[PDB]
PDB file of C-alpha atoms and ligand atoms in Angstrom:
ATOM      1  CA  UNK A   3     122.766  54.350  -7.234  1.00 50.60           C
ATOM      2  CA  UNK A   4     120.847  56.840  -5.094  1.00 52.21           C
ATOM      3  CA  UNK A   5     118.433  59.442  -6.150  1.00 53.64           C
ATOM      4  CA  UNK A   6     119.100  63.171  -6.026  1.00 55.86           C
ATOM      5  CA  UNK A   7     115.463  64.147  -5.011  1.00 53.70           C
ATOM      6  CA  UNK A   8     114.365  67.419  -6.742  1.00 51.15           C
ATOM      7  CA  UNK A   9     111.909  68.714  -4.063  1.00 52.01           C
TER       8      UNK A   9
ATOM      9  CA  UNK B  16     131.448  64.813 -24.854  1.00 51.39           C
ATOM     10  CA  UNK B  17     130.462  61.230 -23.648  1.00 51.19           C
ATOM     11  CA  UNK B  18     126.942  60.273 -22.685  1.00 50.36           C
ATOM     12  CA  UNK B  19     126.194  58.114 -19.477  1.00 49.63           C
ATOM     13  CA  UNK B  20     123.626  56.034 -21.219  1.00 48.66           C
ATOM     14  CA  UNK B  21     124.770  56.123 -25.180  1.00 52.98           C
ATOM     15  CA  UNK B  22     121.477  54.293 -26.014  1.00 52.86           C
ATOM     16  CA  UNK B  23     119.709  57.507 -25.216  1.00 53.84           C
ATOM     17  CA  UNK B  24     121.396  60.090 -27.527  1.00 57.65           C
ATOM     18  CA  UNK B  25     118.039  59.615 -29.126  1.00 56.00           C
ATOM     19  CA  UNK B  26     115.000  61.160 -27.164  1.00 54.01           C
ATOM     20  CA  UNK B  27     112.549  59.103 -29.052  1.00 51.66           C
ATOM     21  CA  UNK B  28     114.227  55.980 -27.362  1.00 51.23           C
ATOM     22  CA  UNK B  29     113.782  57.748 -23.925  1.00 51.66           C
ATOM     23  CA  UNK B  30     110.174  58.364 -24.748  1.00 57.14           C
ATOM     24  CA  UNK B  31     109.673  54.867 -24.841  1.00 51.05           C
ATOM     25  CA  UNK B  32     110.583  54.404 -21.176  1.00 53.36           C
ATOM     26  CA  UNK B  33     107.587  56.004 -19.789  1.00 56.42           C
ATOM     27  CA  UNK B  34     104.849  53.640 -19.475  1.00 59.51           C
ATOM     28  CA  UNK B  35     104.728  52.735 -15.733  1.00 59.92           C
ATOM     29  CA  UNK B  36     105.214  56.342 -15.405  1.00 58.52           C
ATOM     30  CA  UNK B  37     102.101  57.393 -13.375  1.00 57.14           C
ATOM     31  CA  UNK B  38     100.245  59.407 -15.987  1.00 58.00           C
ATOM     32  CA  UNK B  39      98.606  61.288 -13.131  1.00 56.35           C
ATOM     33  CA  UNK B  40     101.710  63.338 -12.178  1.00 58.43           C
ATOM     34  CA  UNK B  41     102.228  66.830 -13.857  1.00 57.50           C
ATOM     35  CA  UNK B  42     105.444  65.910 -15.497  1.00 60.59           C
ATOM     36  CA  UNK B  43     104.665  64.384 -18.920  1.00 59.25           C
ATOM     37  CA  UNK B  44     106.606  61.640 -20.388  1.00 60.58           C
ATOM     38  CA  UNK B  45     107.278  63.979 -23.369  1.00 61.82           C
ATOM     39  CA  UNK B  46     108.908  66.610 -21.145  1.00 63.88           C
ATOM     40  CA  UNK B  47     111.023  64.485 -18.806  1.00 60.32           C
ATOM     41  CA  UNK B  48     112.339  62.337 -21.642  1.00 59.71           C
ATOM     42  CA  UNK B  49     113.125  65.507 -23.495  1.00 59.69           C
ATOM     43  CA  UNK B  50     114.835  67.093 -20.684  1.00 56.94           C
ATOM     44  CA  UNK B  51     117.075  64.071 -21.049  1.00 59.59           C
ATOM     45  CA  UNK B  52     115.400  61.854 -18.584  1.00 60.06           C
ATOM     46  CA  UNK B  53     114.102  58.213 -18.851  1.00 57.82           C
ATOM     47  CA  UNK B  54     111.770  56.551 -16.238  1.00 55.79           C
ATOM     48  CA  UNK B  55     113.708  53.733 -14.262  1.00 52.80           C
ATOM     49  CA  UNK B  56     110.448  51.994 -13.582  1.00 52.01           C
ATOM     50  CA  UNK B  57     109.802  52.699  -9.868  1.00 51.87           C
ATOM     51  CA  UNK B  58     107.382  55.527  -8.526  1.00 48.99           C
ATOM     52  CA  UNK B  59     108.602  58.707 -10.067  1.00 44.72           C
ATOM     53  CA  UNK B  60     112.279  58.186 -10.506  1.00 44.19           C
ATOM     54  CA  UNK B  61     113.629  59.315 -13.703  1.00 41.09           C
ATOM     55  CA  UNK B  62     117.586  59.434 -14.449  1.00 41.43           C
ATOM     56  CA  UNK B  63     119.498  61.821 -16.798  1.00 40.17           C
ATOM     57  CA  UNK B  64     120.845  60.287 -19.804  1.00 41.39           C
ATOM     58  CA  UNK B  65     124.144  62.403 -20.075  1.00 40.54           C
ATOM     59  CA  UNK B  66     124.990  62.690 -16.531  1.00 41.14           C
ATOM     60  CA  UNK B  67     122.973  59.821 -15.002  1.00 41.62           C
ATOM     61  CA  UNK B  68     121.955  62.145 -12.319  1.00 43.32           C
ATOM     62  CA  UNK B  69     119.014  60.615 -10.446  1.00 42.90           C
ATOM     63  CA  UNK B  70     115.918  62.657  -9.466  1.00 43.61           C
ATOM     64  CA  UNK B  71     112.718  61.419  -7.625  1.00 43.09           C
ATOM     65  CA  UNK B  72     110.067  63.111  -5.467  1.00 42.30           C
ATOM     66  CA  UNK B  73     108.251  65.539  -8.122  1.00 44.96           C
ATOM     67  CA  UNK B  74     105.751  68.206  -7.375  1.00 41.75           C
ATOM     68  CA  UNK B  75     102.870  69.635  -9.505  1.00 44.01           C
ATOM     69  CA  UNK B  76     105.130  72.786 -10.127  1.00 41.90           C
ATOM     70  CA  UNK B  77     108.482  70.938 -10.738  1.00 41.68           C
ATOM     71  CA  UNK B  78     109.541  71.484 -14.181  1.00 38.07           C
ATOM     72  CA  UNK B  79     112.228  68.964 -15.815  1.00 38.01           C
ATOM     73  CA  UNK B  80     114.623  71.356 -17.344  1.00 38.56           C
ATOM     74  CA  UNK B  81     114.327  73.555 -14.451  1.00 38.32           C
ATOM     75  CA  UNK B  82     114.963  70.856 -11.912  1.00 36.94           C
ATOM     76  CA  UNK B  83     117.461  69.411 -14.238  1.00 37.53           C
ATOM     77  CA  UNK B  84     119.697  72.831 -13.648  1.00 32.14           C
ATOM     78  CA  UNK B  85     118.983  73.244  -9.952  1.00 33.10           C
ATOM     79  CA  UNK B  86     120.408  69.968  -8.624  1.00 35.24           C
ATOM     80  CA  UNK B  87     122.450  68.711 -11.691  1.00 36.36           C
ATOM     81  CA  UNK B  88     124.290  71.966 -12.535  1.00 37.67           C
ATOM     82  CA  UNK B  89     127.178  70.354 -13.971  1.00 37.07           C
ATOM     83  CA  UNK B  90     125.309  68.295 -16.811  1.00 39.28           C
ATOM     84  CA  UNK B  91     127.315  68.532 -20.182  1.00 35.92           C
ATOM     85  CA  UNK B  92     123.735  67.829 -21.700  1.00 36.67           C
ATOM     86  CA  UNK B  93     121.638  70.623 -20.135  1.00 37.72           C
ATOM     87  CA  UNK B  94     124.669  73.088 -20.535  1.00 38.86           C
ATOM     88  CA  UNK B  95     124.751  72.165 -24.191  1.00 39.11           C
ATOM     89  CA  UNK B  96     121.116  72.446 -25.201  1.00 38.04           C
ATOM     90  CA  UNK B  97     119.988  75.344 -22.974  1.00 33.66           C
ATOM     91  CA  UNK B  98     122.968  77.124 -22.321  1.00 37.62           C
ATOM     92  CA  UNK B  99     124.973  78.265 -19.278  1.00 36.79           C
ATOM     93  CA  UNK B 100     122.836  81.514 -19.089  1.00 38.90           C
ATOM     94  CA  UNK B 101     119.662  79.551 -18.670  1.00 39.49           C
ATOM     95  CA  UNK B 102     121.571  77.509 -15.775  1.00 37.80           C
ATOM     96  CA  UNK B 103     122.579  80.801 -14.314  1.00 35.64           C
ATOM     97  CA  UNK B 104     119.083  82.535 -14.033  1.00 32.09           C
ATOM     98  CA  UNK B 105     118.041  79.039 -12.589  1.00 34.22           C
ATOM     99  CA  UNK B 106     120.462  79.322  -9.752  1.00 34.43           C
ATOM    100  CA  UNK B 107     120.297  83.354  -9.503  1.00 34.01           C
ATOM    101  CA  UNK B 108     116.679  82.846  -7.747  1.00 33.70           C
ATOM    102  CA  UNK B 109     117.861  82.976  -4.823  1.00 32.99           C
ATOM    103  CA  UNK B 110     117.140  86.328  -5.896  1.00 31.44           C
ATOM    104  CA  UNK B 111     114.590  85.762  -3.252  1.00 34.08           C
ATOM    105  CA  UNK B 112     117.154  84.840  -0.613  1.00 34.44           C
ATOM    106  CA  UNK B 113     118.559  88.333  -0.608  1.00 34.13           C
ATOM    107  CA  UNK B 114     115.031  89.508  -0.280  1.00 35.56           C
ATOM    108  CA  UNK B 115     114.115  87.434   2.902  1.00 36.24           C
ATOM    109  CA  UNK B 116     117.276  88.511   4.601  1.00 34.19           C
TER     110      UNK B 116
HETATM  111 ZN1  LIG C   1     121.942  65.566 -16.604  1.00 36.89          ZN
END
């Protein structure tokens, strides 16, 4: 489960 | 409608997850959690409750609801609370991309 960075 | 983390339909229960959440960061646990997030416990990584969209790397100016519309445009959660119009204007800015040229 990856992370969709915001910045 | 069908939440990704049904145990979060309650924000109060999402609030409870921001303890290890570096209090130093501009993004307060009240906001994040309210924007449908909950801290995953590592760094600044918080996930959405109704789309499970993950979001890390936050900057002083990054606003929860905001970012929650910029990268997770399809959240049945955001699209129901703040509306589509809100999601539009979020995306339609880019009004700056047609100014740069
Ligand atoms: Zn979401």
